[PDB]
Design a protein around this ligand. Structure first.
Ligand SMILES: O=C(O)c1ccccc1C(=O)O
Ligand SMILES: O=C(O)c1ccccc1C(=O)O
Ligand SMILES: O=C(O)c1ccccc1C(=O)O
Ligand SMILES: O=C(O)c1ccccc1C(=O)O
Ligand SMILES: O=C(O)c1ccccc1C(=O)O
Ligand SMILES: O=C(O)c1ccccc1C(=O)O
Lengths: 273, 273, 273, 273, 273, 273
């Protein structure tokens, strides 16, 4: 399976040479445990939690679903298995859920402020080492959308790359054959002119980077007049207090890396009840 | 190397099938790039950064060290190598330094508020999946100390465990020969009575879990009168606004997991020329 | 590096417990060897060959380049290193070059018959186990283009998927948010009607699957009239004797899986000269 | 299992970051699919197919066996499982069976042309990277035999080696104690004289590399008169139109690497309902 | 699980390219076998054996348990599975059990001659490569106790480490904020004057390296005068003929690496029947 | 390389989470150490040691070589590197050399008591888990010879395998087309009447299992009457006090697993200075 290795390594990291408690534990036995919330939020990590449990021979009697909301004291999952194994898994199972739900919850906040069904909230490639896929999955459970998953996923050209491209329209036209047939090219822009030249150069997507709502709005309109099939994305240090204003500019999407890199853990815990 | 694989995994996740730009960059060349700050903070991730650069074939001309403070606009690292590799490694490098430094910086604020040279600040086993060692290393670079690194490091018995241990003293006595000779045992207590009976049980370390400063002083005092070689640790949602008060409690260490799980990325970016 | 693991496993597979010859070999010594051609063709596998040599401490004095043509008796590479290691690497190094150049050469034939710079020749996801990336790279060196590299690369819907989609236009419109922001959706069609409905449904690409040149031509024209930004691909059992005719229908690309699955080894060998 | 990892690698390469359809398939369900033929041929890959299906959680209702012949339109396998997994595994399964069967079928035509029950047909160490064991297994399913599987299997000295061995007899004599007790030694010869002196040197097997049938009979005869326990093998661009002639040469085996490196995919496809 | 990788690798080394018998066997059938002893000793390796059979298909019908004594002829295990898999696992099963029991048994003889319950037998970091966890687990089954399991488990300082500092006091006092909070510091000493310094330094344990019983007692008693909590261990060489002598010297533990680095296999064997 | 993975894993088991000393050390410096012997024996493991130091940074200044004899006090290796890396590698370096030399040396004593050059000493498939290649390599360094290295190396039939067929003749005659062309078939026998059948069956080797010298000679001589080429091996138990006796029995080899499964470490140690 796609994430069985992820969980093995998550786990491996915690018990190193071997769990000391399992050595001292007099007799083992089947026990039931519950994962309870200590905060409110959106639950994320279900897919990873079931694989971890499966992986370790722990049964999953009950669980809420990946996009469900919850209040503190809510039981999130009811698991049953060896006492020794519930303990060896506990922190891994909880770090998983707490981290992942933290992102879904922070993300849900933005989706909320955004308030629009026509405009999409996107994440970024700013993720923590080894958690690209894990965190991207989290953002989804919060109610938003994912941007490309990597550098193989699509071509994104910004100032760094552009500074060395003599003729952009020429470059894009002739790059298409050295890129897979299905790839889209996106050009990051910092002005209306740049955006205009990008659309005419052949871009499939233009990123209005660090531009006022007015600026963006102008670009959005121009795209509507000419290049109606080119996609527009607004990006920059967009805050919760800033998102709604941008959703009205006409861009198709808004990306805020903070959805992942500014998210923190939600409080949960395991009761052997 | 120890963290060699870690760095390979972080990279793979990002280029997947292969970086696309690399396919269209007509002519590759050596270039220099700078990792600049956009926020003040404590630098962390040097050990990883340097290993990433080396296995990647990029040279490190200059770089500040693992604990230096810095302010916006400051140049943190100067690297040189193939243009194509600089771009392929960019996000991995930054995400790495921004995440590691975020934790160090956050920890930094607790080390100050704590304000002590006798009471050490510790982390927890609450760490993001696959980033334990990474996040623990990060905490060290903020000026604090580390707690055990795993379930193999030492034996820590809490509520769940204790509910099945009827006679501690005896349990702890006979547990010794089944643990590695060097292991220490720690017991979480939520009342003066629990701590007192843990000390008498033969505990090496006692945790004062969610107790007023007064409550804690009481245990600290008792430990000094009798049981002078038992380490006391206080923990329990200990905020930035209360650690200092707890530092005066008379404890040896104060553990706050938020140093890691409530930390966020420090703004940083890579710039050519 | 991206393909260092590929080569380790290629190699590992050949010497199993350990090369027997290196046991019996009296004295080792630096020797020079040449990879010579025994057929004509396009050379492919340079990127993999240099990594293998590097990996095993073999120097690469000279080599032709990945898209260069060659006649039999041509020296392709001049390598130098331990006699024992040249022998342990020989077959791996040659299977690499022979297989990879076999694909580039068969591919070059199609590019030739195609005779067009406006139309692109694409491969498919029909590759040999564990060689997806290796073979895709080969097709490029033959002078053609790659189709998506996998199922994460782009969405491709065909009869199998469509049979369960009530309203296609609705499905595509609402799928966009659950797919990364940069993904393109392609619909495989087996009639002019299907193609027409696909473009109107919202597809970014339509595949004219198993359609006469006339059929294709009709679809190509319609796309030009309406939906000028939708991409067209002709596919099916297109033969060398059939490609040129299709290149004149108006489609943007033609894909033939045979480029990879009908390619065979080119004759080469290593002379210790 | 032995081929467990192999199958994991093949799959990973295909879904990379994750299958996209899976993201948009609104409702998953169990379904049945058939693997049908579009060409006549010999079936191969059952061992791999079944392991792929099992680790993938797909059931195998029916399947023909590893050596059965088949014709177009024939249903080769009947499988059942989640719709989403059937689609994610489709290409990997087919590519696997089409490649394995291609080799078996091609080998099949040589086994016939050879037409003998005393002379066995062998493959070579010329196999596509990472597919050695896979391709060798495939050859077995065509009705032929396998040569050694690697450089550890046995010791085969050819031109390159021999140019540095001045006194074979002596070399072979003292080589024995440095090889594993069970190893056999083989020596490639390109003339009656070379073979004769190899036999006398103490060779277990002699290869008649690129020699007329007459030339070979000469060596075969000599081997029968003296050295009756030495295995003779003939090889050297031995085509489908000459093996039979060589079978009568008096050799024990005829090796042709093209059984693997000139084989191509057998047309096959997966169909629901 | 935790040692499933260990077993895959073990089994991987024996079969390599693939077991030859299975290519010969006509029809496979389910058969039973018995791991029977041919010598007297203490059984060990039940944990790995059961995991090996499970991940390998073979069914475990009956088995004595870790730490149970046995005599020649005794049947230690009864397994059930395919004729081929039993033959393929046989060697790997026995090597585990024999090497493991070999260490348990030799350990039990030191345990026996130690004759004490206030003193425990320890092992060392002197283990065969890749087998530490395996061999440490084997010692426990002999009835003794394990020492730390690696350099991450605890800090063990000796001359080479301390060659150079002036303080032990401050060195140790400051090494504390750099070690995980729960880690102990043991110091190896060679003279009373040394052990004396360690205790005044702040050590948590002291090793009396190959000293005399009269030398040890001086320290044992001194340890009681003050520093009643600091543990004492003192084997440097010790032997069966000298363990007991030390047990009555006043130390808490006696480590002897020979329990592992001097153990040899126990005769066992698998018989179908 | 081929055993670089072996070393990474070995070193990985010792440090785990990370060496503790390095978290304490103030300033690291380059230092020298000497692997000195404390016992007499035959050196082995030069191959792994040099690879371990290289991949680990430490520089190898001087070293005796595989198969060279040494006495107590003798300096076997002189290494140069960082103080930390030497301490971190020490244990892992010695365990390799000691366990390896331990096997070489014990093997050399059997070689010595065998006193023959027309008869070679073999080892068995009785090796510690994960150490076969290592231990087989260690025997060679003792001056003896290795047997097959696994079940893929050759086919070795005994009662359990043959319990059931009627023919050996046809069984073997047909097992040939299913085994790689270069593979040998050895048959273990327990009585003249058995070895007699094997030769008439077509065996390539025959093992005289724990028989008497008079029993062996009957077969040795018989082997000469007819079947001069089929090799003979005959140890079943053999010992130092009985090897020579067999060497003069007429067999080509004498295998004794005890060379490995009875070897113990050789005393060595690392000293800074
Ligand atoms: O990380 C970025 O620079 C980034 C920012 C916004 C959207 C997309 C990306 C991306 O690279 O995928
Ligand atoms: O996560 C915990 O329960 C924990 C909390 C505080 C200190 C230490 C730990 C630990 O297990 O290492
Ligand atoms: O393999 C196919 O069905 C296929 C065929 C033609 C183009 C693209 C693909 C693809 O899936 O990428
Ligand atoms: O590839 C070769 O050189 C080769 C050719 C013919 C038979 C066997 C081999 C072999 O090495 O196994
Ligand atoms: O090998 C050693 O130096 C050693 C010796 C005796 C006990 C413990 C150890 C240890 O380091 O764990
Ligand atoms: O372990 C055995 O049965 C064995 C014993 C002696 C020689 C060789 C072997 C072998 O199988 O390679």
């Amino acid at each position: 399976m796609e994430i069985r290795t992820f969980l093995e390594r998550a786990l491996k990291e915690d018990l190193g040479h071997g769990d000391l408690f399992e050595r001292v534990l007099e007799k083992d036995f089947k026990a039931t445990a519950f994962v309870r919330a200590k905060q409110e939020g959106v639950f994320s990590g279900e897919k990873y939690a079931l694989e971890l449990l499966e992986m370790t021979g722990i049964e999953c009697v009950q669980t809420i679903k990946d996009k469900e909301r919850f209040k503190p004291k809510d039981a999130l999952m009811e698991i049953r298995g060896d006492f020794s194994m519930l303990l060896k898994v506990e922190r891994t199972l909880l770090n998983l859920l707490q981290h992942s739900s933290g992102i879904a919850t922070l993300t849900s906040r933005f989706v909320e402020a955004l308030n629009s069904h026509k405009v999409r909230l996107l994440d970024t490639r700013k993720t923590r080492p080894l958690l690209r896929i894990f965190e991207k999955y989290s953002v989804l459970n919060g109610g938003a959308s994912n941007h490309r998953l990597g550098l193989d996923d699509a071509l994104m050209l910004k100032d760094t790359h552009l500074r060395h491209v003599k003729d952009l329209k020429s470059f894009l036209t002739h790059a298409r054959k050295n890129l897979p047939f299905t790839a889209k090219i996106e050009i990051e822009c910092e002005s209306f002119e740049e955006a205009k030249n990008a659309m005419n150069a052949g871009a499939d997507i233009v990123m209005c980077d660090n531009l006022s709502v007015l600026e963006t709005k102008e670009i959005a309109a121009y795209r509507d007049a000419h290049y109606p099939f080119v996609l527009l994305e607004a990006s920059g240090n967009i805050s919760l207090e800033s998102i709604n204003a941008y959703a009205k500019s006409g861009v198709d999407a808004i990306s805020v890396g903070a959805l992942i890199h500014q998210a923190t853990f939600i409080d949960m815990h395991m009761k052997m009840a």
